[PDB]
């Protein structure tokens, strides 16, 4: 039909009338091949997979678990998503997503054109459950995906990513030179859970080439206590890192990060940004190594961790308008200061970090983590502890604001949306610290 | 606006 519709849940490569996920990808690979003998071999489909429109969209059915016995190499631009039409669409979002699970010890995908100079293509993975080999993983690099192209993952679950480097994704590629073959990873509205690596617990990127937004990062580990979940191997060769940070294209935003183990969450280099995240109840938080001063951490909650922040002796990262302890207040601007966390201030309004919220508790900034029925990702809900006359003394609510200044002040500007996609400054002029805008 | 055009990446990344 219009799209390539997979008609089986088993990993097959047999010429017949049933189309598998592997044969669907290989159809798009052979279609984009340079050998006309290969392109002509798929002029009428491949081993059961086909579509009249001849686009590169692979459709998986809802609530189906698709099994892979080994990785699949993607060498052409394509999309893999779950069926859209409900065929009554009032269920919990994220449910009815197709599942791509590993039946052996290998990774799920490798995304690379296998050639030099050939500019990077694009790949979209939407509304999927990517489940790796977990403790059975023999993957060295990229427990779920080994990426060398421009990859965009949305509305997905990323679990089971076990490797030595890059639990979920090993992002390969260098961007500082004239090489456009780099890999970029953009993850939005997703759940990163139960992933482990010796370095790069979630993403191992050779350069700061990732952007995580509106996502939830929980229960992940990097075994090296000096490593990070979102690791950047090398830094940019002064490729105007100040230009990289004003665009806010590399880093973490509108994301809840908690219950992660081992090393830091990420190593902040020049060109990266952190805005409107809630980073609580982790082993280690942010490691700061921005020698040129072209990095911004703003509007975030950076408390409740065993080590909230740690810095290299030559770091000049800008920390503005955050709820931090003393060790993360690098003061930065006087016009955009940070909000220091009061000693002995209760953080969670409950007996656990996840569960029911003591809605009668006069103290406690955040409710315990909870996933609402109308949403796919949970969060720590902010609570109003101050009166209207004393709202200026609140540690979270109405403490951020849009600046649009162009200098260091603009780096502390609010995010337009929050983790749930709600507009922070649509109906007002201020925003609330953390990943969630206070709505009630 | 940064790493090149793309159908799925955000504008500030492009």
Residue numbers in the entry:
A (entry chain A): 2 to 88, 91 to 443
B (entry chain B): 1 to 14
Provide the authors' original text about this structure.
X-ray structures for macrocycle-bound myeloid cell leukemia 1, γ-aminobutyric acid type A receptor-associated protein and RbtA complexes match closely with the computational models, with a Cα root-mean-square deviation < 1.5 Å to the design models.
On the basis of our preliminary design runs without hotspots to guide the diffusion, we identified a patch in the N-terminal domain to pursue in our large-scale design calculations against this target and defined hotspots Leu144, Phe202, Phe204, Tyr206, Val208, Leu231 and Ala269 for peptide backbone generation. In contrast to the concave pockets targeted for MDM2 and MCL1, this selected patch for RbtA is considerably flatter and difficult to target with conventional computational and experimental approaches. On the basis of further binding experiments with SPR, we determined the dissociation constant (Kd) of the best binder, RBB_D10, to be 9.4 nM. To confirm the structures of RbtA and RBB_D10 and the binding mode between them, we determined the high-resolution X-ray crystal structure of apo and macrocycle-bound RbtA using X-ray crystallography at 2 Å and 2.6 Å resolution, respectively. Notably, the conformation adopted by the macrocycle in the X-ray structure, including the side-chain rotamers involved in interactions with the target, was almost identical to the design model with an r.m.s.d. of 0.4 Å. Together, these data highlight the high accuracy and success rates provided by RFpeptides even while designing macrocycles against targets without deep pockets or targets with no known structures.
